[PDB]
Amino acid sequence: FAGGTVSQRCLSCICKMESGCRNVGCKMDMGSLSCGYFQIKEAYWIDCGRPGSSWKSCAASSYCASLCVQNYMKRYAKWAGCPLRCEGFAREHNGGPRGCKKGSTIGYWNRLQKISGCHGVQ
Numbered sequence: 687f688a689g690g691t692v693s694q695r696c697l698s699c700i701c702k703m704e705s706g707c708r709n710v711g712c713k714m715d716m717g718s719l720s721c722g723y724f725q726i727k728e729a730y731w732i733d734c735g736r737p738g739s740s741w742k743s744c745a746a747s748s749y750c751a752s753l754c755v756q757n758y759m760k761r762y763a764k765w766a767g768c769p770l771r772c773e774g775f776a777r778e779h780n781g782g783p784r785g786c787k788k789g790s791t792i793g794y795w796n797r798l799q800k801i802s803g804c805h806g807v808q
């Protein structure tokens with residue numbers, strides 16, 4: 687995956703959690719479409735710098751999508767006061783700018799850790 691502050695192991699786990707790390711296309715999720723490997727929404731894509739040729743094209747690329755995640759965490763993680771490790775990045779990914787502070791994302795983290803090789807992933 688693209689490099690940055692999020693570890694390759696963490697990205698692999700999030701990728702698996704979101705789509706079994708496959709180009710699964712889009713799904714309507716809580717009001718808007720989530721697409722590709724990391725199930726990135728359009729707002730998330732805009733916030734991570736609009737990488738790739740387009741939102742859906744980027745989302746369908748494991749590299750572009752992961753770069754977006756890297757940029758998103760670089761932009762919001764520390765700002766939101768998140769633990770600068772997968773637990774925080776994963777929660778930010780699922781809940782937004784302050785997702786790591788939302789009780790809502792506690793379940794996401796616990797479910798992600800049930801994935802082979804992802805328990806306590808950093």
Ligand SMILES: CC(=O)N[C@@H]1[C@@H](O)[C@H](O[C@@H]2O[C@H](CO)[C@@H](O[C@@H]3O[C@H](CO)[C@@H](O)[C@H](O)[C@H]3NC(C)=O)[C@H](O)[C@H]2NC(C)=O)[C@@H](CO)O[C@H]1O
Pocket residue numbers: 716720724725726727728729730731732733779780781782783
């Ligand atoms: C991987 C993914 O798509 N995760 C989804 C989250 O992104 C989404 O939370 C929402 O994230 C967007 C994008 O960061 C938030 O919009 C931004 O909010 C900031 C701060 O308030 C604002 O300055 C930006 O302009 C704005 N960006 C845009 C492009 O509109 C939005 O507030 C988040 N929504 C909530 C309710 O927290 C969550 C939504 O549940 O879904 C994940 O799947």
